[PDB]
Design an enzyme around this catalytic site. Structure first.
Site, PDB file in Angstrom:
ATOM      1  CB  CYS B 154      -0.886  -0.014   1.222  1.00  0.00           C
ATOM      2  SG  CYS B 154       0.131  -0.177   2.684  1.00  0.00           S
ATOM      3  CG  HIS B 181       1.882   1.897   7.608  1.00  0.00           C
ATOM      4  ND1 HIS B 181       1.599   2.147   6.287  1.00  0.00           N
ATOM      5  CD2 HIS B 181       1.517   0.618   7.835  1.00  0.00           C
ATOM      6  CE1 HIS B 181       1.051   1.075   5.746  1.00  0.00           C
ATOM      7  NE2 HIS B 181       0.984   0.134   6.667  1.00  0.00           N
TER       8      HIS B 181
HETATM    9  N1  LIG Z   1      -3.417  -4.350   6.395  1.00  0.00           N
HETATM   10  C1  LIG Z   1      -3.443  -3.498   5.383  1.00  0.00           C
HETATM   11  O1  LIG Z   1      -4.024  -2.419   5.435  1.00  0.00           O
HETATM   12  C2  LIG Z   1      -2.707  -3.882   4.129  1.00  0.00           C
HETATM   13  C3  LIG Z   1      -2.432  -2.988   3.115  1.00  0.00           C
HETATM   14  C4  LIG Z   1      -1.818  -3.420   1.969  1.00  0.00           C
HETATM   15  C5  LIG Z   1      -1.464  -4.741   1.857  1.00  0.00           C
HETATM   16  N2  LIG Z   1      -1.685  -5.601   2.859  1.00  0.00           N
HETATM   17  C6  LIG Z   1      -1.290  -7.021   2.728  1.00  0.00           C
HETATM   18  O2  LIG Z   1      -2.480  -7.775   2.679  1.00  0.00           O
HETATM   19  C7  LIG Z   1      -2.243  -9.079   3.241  1.00  0.00           C
HETATM   20  C8  LIG Z   1      -3.361  -9.394   4.201  1.00  0.00           C
HETATM   21  O3  LIG Z   1      -3.693  -8.214   4.961  1.00  0.00           O
HETATM   22  P1  LIG Z   1      -4.882  -8.350   6.017  1.00  0.00           P
HETATM   23  O4  LIG Z   1      -4.904  -7.153   6.905  1.00  0.00           O
HETATM   24  O5  LIG Z   1      -6.142  -8.739   5.321  1.00  0.00           O
HETATM   25  O6  LIG Z   1      -4.360  -9.587   6.876  1.00  0.00           O
HETATM   26  P2  LIG Z   1      -5.095 -10.259   8.121  1.00  0.00           P
HETATM   27  O7  LIG Z   1      -4.122 -11.113   8.860  1.00  0.00           O
HETATM   28  O8  LIG Z   1      -5.820  -9.181   8.850  1.00  0.00           O
HETATM   29  O9  LIG Z   1      -6.156 -11.204   7.395  1.00  0.00           O
HETATM   30  C9  LIG Z   1      -5.650 -12.329   6.646  1.00  0.00           C
HETATM   31  C10 LIG Z   1      -6.698 -13.411   6.653  1.00  0.00           C
HETATM   32  O10 LIG Z   1      -6.187 -14.566   5.936  1.00  0.00           O
HETATM   33  C11 LIG Z   1      -6.305 -15.695   6.766  1.00  0.00           C
HETATM   34  N3  LIG Z   1      -5.288 -16.662   6.382  1.00  0.00           N
HETATM   35  C12 LIG Z   1      -3.954 -16.608   6.686  1.00  0.00           C
HETATM   36  N4  LIG Z   1      -3.273 -17.617   6.209  1.00  0.00           N
HETATM   37  C13 LIG Z   1      -4.219 -18.393   5.562  1.00  0.00           C
HETATM   38  C14 LIG Z   1      -4.124 -19.605   4.857  1.00  0.00           C
HETATM   39  N5  LIG Z   1      -2.987 -20.269   4.684  1.00  0.00           N
HETATM   40  N6  LIG Z   1      -5.264 -20.113   4.332  1.00  0.00           N
HETATM   41  C15 LIG Z   1      -6.405 -19.439   4.510  1.00  0.00           C
HETATM   42  N7  LIG Z   1      -6.612 -18.293   5.150  1.00  0.00           N
HETATM   43  C16 LIG Z   1      -5.467 -17.815   5.662  1.00  0.00           C
HETATM   44  C17 LIG Z   1      -6.127 -15.128   8.165  1.00  0.00           C
HETATM   45  O11 LIG Z   1      -6.481 -16.038   9.183  1.00  0.00           O
HETATM   46  C18 LIG Z   1      -7.078 -13.941   8.041  1.00  0.00           C
HETATM   47  O12 LIG Z   1      -8.410 -14.430   8.008  1.00  0.00           O
HETATM   48  C19 LIG Z   1      -0.826  -9.018   3.819  1.00  0.00           C
HETATM   49  O13 LIG Z   1       0.093  -9.397   2.807  1.00  0.00           O
HETATM   50  C20 LIG Z   1      -0.645  -7.515   4.009  1.00  0.00           C
HETATM   51  O14 LIG Z   1       0.712  -7.118   4.096  1.00  0.00           O
HETATM   52  C21 LIG Z   1      -2.278  -5.186   4.008  1.00  0.00           C
END
Ligand SMILES: NC(=O)c1ccc[n+]([C@@H]2O[C@H](COP(=O)([O-])OP(=O)(O)OC[C@H]3O[C@@H](n4cnc5c(N)ncnc54)[C@H](O)[C@@H]3O)[C@@H](O)[C@H]2O)c1
Lengths: 319, 337, 75, 319
Positions: B154, B181
């Site tokens: 992001c 952030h």
């Molecule tokens: N948080 C943000 O605002 C943001 C911004 C840009 C990019 N990202 C990227 O997005 C990705 C996810 O962000 P998020 O906040 O949604 O993460 P999160 O941890 O809040 O949610 C991830 C979800 O995926 C599930 N999960 C994890 N491993 C899994 C697997 N092997 N099989 C099935 N489900 C699985 C988790 O249990 C959870 O439900 C990361 O790479 C993060 O760096 C996040």
């Protein structure tokens, strides 16, 4: 390699000093001269019979000149015919050889479009009708032929087809030099001091413009002042971006009479992209021939500037 | 119409689903599969009641243990951590949206390709030479045989359009950044055990700093600036939105008003819908849910010595990033091969 | 303004009187019009200061700055 | 050290925006303001009794102002009286202290010759009578005092002694800014767009001129063209060496209205010897105050150019 230079104007073929300045610049060893009255179809007898001038697109064998012009690129010695000028007739041809630089000059150097695709650099040379009259008065005054003031009526009779035949070629030339009566000086005869301007065209690479202090913003500079004591009337330059015939051009313009040396080096120190390997080289090329007509005004400045851009195009073409 | 899927129904997944529910009519994408580590009863509730974007209002959300009915539209749902046991060819999946934060490698993400999916779009800066694409910079230059594509982070997704504009208009020698952030889900709430020590500490209490390579990802998406962009990140206790500071060393000298003029006209000619330009004295929470991927804050832009510029950009790393993910997904649907 | 509001019109009456009566081109009524122009200049100086009349903040923070409406810890 | 700056004009003491631009440049911490209506001899009552304007060399105690001005150099806190402006009377004085920069401004900052030997840098500020009328129409129109069109007859009555008393001071100032009606635009009211010119003087060291592309050769530049899309009517600069009152001067002149940003940075990139430590610093000093009157035309350009030369003189005086 074969390079090619197109000159357009009714100053008589080989009868203008711009070719003389090119001769002082290149040398007749490196370049050869080709008049273009030689490719006339038929004679002044047939001009009188057909009722036609020497300006007709019928009146020239435009294809055989193209064949010799294309054979010029291939290195072979061309065989060009010769207009016998006193009789109006045609000589059996002369076998001449190509050179490093080939020039083309006449009334129609550019009317053909395949040779317009062939010519490496082009120059139209325009003249206003006032200095036409002022040059014909000197023409029939120095000779004392006593043929004046009906040549005035020959002018406007020569006019209308000329604007149809010749003047649309300038919509395809690179550089066009107009020569006007001077707005600066009034109490002279009408042909002493010239108001000259070299409308040069952007676009086609290798050819830079020559810009006065800024590319593309009109600037009217008078070099009189703290370091130059100007005589009467002195110089008044100009510059301006413009779009002539819907084409991106850049007029560089000079009015006045060069009376001495320092006012001609001081102007040359401030022009830009003039493509010199040598400081003041334009002033040296002005003063290698003090006797040439038009050295004391901007005509001799602009002609050698165009020839210096021809040096630039030749160095671009020969690496 | 392209049948798409979502791996990991977390923040990015819920925002992706909500965006597609708000951009349904103009879509060549139909969301047909999701999988989370939760049952289908819970994540429908988490979709409807987001504690950041409020209660969803436009369509009705319900579920039973096998499917989820969003506004009458049915969507399948399963739960497995192994990507190799997943019904992709059984569901007809062209594009899966990797959003677990786990499968960042090529070999990890390619497990879906092996298991019966045709293309994968991973929402993370992936390890290894995965082709990365940012909407608004180089979303055109992807080859459609590249089935494994990556959107960047992001922070990179916000920063790279500004760096593109300033590199085209002025030319950049070097450049730093320091993004303030919002806290993400990776940080432990209280001081708990974690792989990295600066993320092990409490999130609601602390400015925790972290080193990121997401500034260098601009050097991937803009090739002639690689090895010239680097920066750190500061995680502060705000839940949603964030701001990025950016210090560039341009070489064509200018003043602070002119770079604002350049970015203002770039907001209206080329970066329209990517960069918004705001001459208001807003604050962070007035950018929750903004559609642009970078709001340039106008009043703080400054230039010292002519050749040293600083901009700051508000961006929502949970909504605008999801918008760019969905725009990249539709843009790869429009050039399906 | 009431005082100079009257005095400008009084000097205008004098400008009509003394420079039609005691010499239209001499030092006396030139001094009179110079006076009336200075009265006009102070009307201008009053006008510009009343254009710069603050509404509330440069009053309530003029007298009581540390209230929560205008603490500035420019830090 | 003590430096000194003389400003001359009838724009009201402390009632012109050039002092505001100096305040934005230096700061009221580093400089203090001294009006010069305070040294009046006697009141408007005695002006009416003596039949005399506020422009008389009798009408000021020119010696006590000189004594305080010389005591300003020695560091001591001066005690200057105050013209009570509403009553015409005189306040018992105020004890004010010197600063890094001291300014002097009034109708006679330069009439004395010993203080003319004292002032480190001088500015006259001229106004043509047309924009005088156009400013007094705004003066009695915004106030709605209904005192117009006999103030027209106050103008030419204020005129003749003013040319005797004040206008020979400009023969000793360094920089004089004239403001004219614009020759460029015609279909407006007569005070919208100004044709301004800053006749600056050579000679006295430290003060460079600011020359447009060349020292000492008149050059009239229009920055419209390939890189600027000019609105109506756009800008038309000028420049010229000259000898004003038999003194070597260099007029730099601007006509037009600045409508946007790029046309104001493009002009500033081409002025020379403007004495900036910072690229585009003149444009930043223009746009730190968009609300100031005259920022959109050349008056705000020239005032901050003169103030920037005052920075140059201050850095020359303080090493
Ligand atoms: N948080 C943000 O605002 C943001 C911004 C840009 C990019 N990202 C990227 O997005 C990705 C996810 O962000 P998020 O906040 O949604 O993460 P999160 O941890 O809040 O949610 C991830 C979800 O995926 C599930 N999960 C994890 N491993 C899994 C697997 N092997 N099989 C099935 N489900 C699985 C988790 O249990 C959870 O439900 C990361 O790479 C993060 O760096 C996040």
């Amino acid at each position: 390699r074969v390079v090619l230079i197109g000159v357009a104007g009714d100053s008589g073929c080989g009868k203008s000093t711009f070719l003389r300045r090119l001769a002082d610049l290149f040398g007749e060893d490196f370049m050869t001269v080709i008049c273009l009255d030689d490719y006339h179809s038929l004679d002044r007898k047939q001009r009188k019979e057909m009722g036609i001038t020497a300006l007709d697109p019928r009146a020239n064998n435009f294809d055989l000149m193209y064949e010799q012009i294309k054979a010029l690129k291939n290195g072979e010695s061309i065989m060009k015919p010769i207009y016998n000028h006193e009789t109006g007739t045609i000589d059996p041809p002369e076998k001449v050889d190509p050179n490093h630089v080939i020039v083309i000059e006449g009334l129609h150097p550019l009317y053909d479009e395949r040779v317009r695709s062939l010519i490496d650099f082009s120059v139209y040379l325009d003249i206003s009708d006032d200095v036409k009259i002022a040059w014909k008065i000197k023409r029939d005054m120095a000779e004392r032929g006593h043929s004046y003031e009906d040549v005035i009526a020959s002018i406007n009779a020569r006019r209308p087809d000329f604007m149809a035949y010749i003047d649309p070629q300038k919509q395809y030339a690179d550089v066009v030099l107009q020569i006007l009566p001077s707005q600066l000086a009034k109490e002279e005869k009408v042909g002493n001091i010239l108001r000259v301007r070299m409308l040069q065209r952007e676009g086609i690479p290798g050819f830079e413009p020559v810009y006065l202090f800024d590319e593309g913003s009109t600037i009217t500079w008078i070099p009189c002042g703290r370091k130059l004591t100007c005589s009467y009337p002195g110089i008044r330059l100009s510059y301006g971006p413009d779009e002539y015939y819907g084409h991106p051009v850049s007029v560089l313009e000079v009015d006045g009479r060069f009376e001495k040396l320092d006012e001609l080096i001081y102007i040359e120190s401030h022009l830009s992209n003039t493509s010199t390997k040598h400081y003041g080289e334009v002033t040296e090329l002005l003063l290698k021939h003090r006797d040439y007509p038009g050295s004391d005004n901007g005509s001799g400045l602009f002609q050698v500037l165009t020839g210096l851009k021809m040096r630039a195009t030749y160095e671009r073409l020969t690496s | 119409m392209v049948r798409v899927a979502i791996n990991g129904f977390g923040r990015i997944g819920r925002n992706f689903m909500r965006c597609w529910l708000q951009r349904k009519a103009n879509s060549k994408l139909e969301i047909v599969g999701i999988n989370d580590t939760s049952d289908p009863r819970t994540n429908a509730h988490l979709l409807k009641y987001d504690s950041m974007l409020g209660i969803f209002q436009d369509a009705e959300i319900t579920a039973d243990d096998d499917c989820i009915y969003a506004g009458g539209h049915a969507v399948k749902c399963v739960s497995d951590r192994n990507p190799e046991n997943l019904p992709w060819s059984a569901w007809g999946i062209d594009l899966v949206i990797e959003a677990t934060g786990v499968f960042t490698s090529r070999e990890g993400a390619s497990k879906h390709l092996s298991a019966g999916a045709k293309k994968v779009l991973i929402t993370a800066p992936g390890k290894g030479n995965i082709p990365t694409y940012v909407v608004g910079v180089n979303h055109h230059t992807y080859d459609p045989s590249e089935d494994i594509v990556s959107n960047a982070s992001c922070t990179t997704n916000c920063l790279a359009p500004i760096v593109k504009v300033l590199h085209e208009a002025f030319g950049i020698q070097q450049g730093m950044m320091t993004t303030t952030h919002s806290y993400t889900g990776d940080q432990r709430l209280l001081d708990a055990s974690h792989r990295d020590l600066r993320r092990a500490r409490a999130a609601a209490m602390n400015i925790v700093p972290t080193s990121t390579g997401a500034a260098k990802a601009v050097g991937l998406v803009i090739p002639e600036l690689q090895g010239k962009l680097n920066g750190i990140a500061l995680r502060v206790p705000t839940p949603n939105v964030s701001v990025v500071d950016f210090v560039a060393q341009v070489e064509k000298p200018t003043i602070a008003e002119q770079v604002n003029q350049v970015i203002k006209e770039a907001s209206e000619t080329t970066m329209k819908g990517i960069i918004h330009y705001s001459e208001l004295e807003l604050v962070s929470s007035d950018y929750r849910g903004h559609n642009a991927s970078s709001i340039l804050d106008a009043s703080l832009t400054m230039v010292l010595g002519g050749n040293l510029v600083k901009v700051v950009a508000w961006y929502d790393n949970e909504w605008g990033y999801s918008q760019r993910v969905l725009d990249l997904a539709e843009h790869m649907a429009a050039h399906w091969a | 303004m009431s005082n100079l509001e009257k005095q400008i019109e009084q000097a205008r009456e004098e400008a009509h009187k003394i420079c039609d009566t005691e010499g239209a081109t001499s030092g006396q009524c030139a001094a009179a019009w110079d006076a009336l122009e200075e009265l006009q200049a102070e009307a201008a100086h009053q006008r510009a200061e009343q254009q710069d009349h603050k509404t509330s903040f440069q009053q309530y923070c003029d007298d009581n700055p540390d209230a929560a409406e205008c603490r500035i810890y420019d830090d």
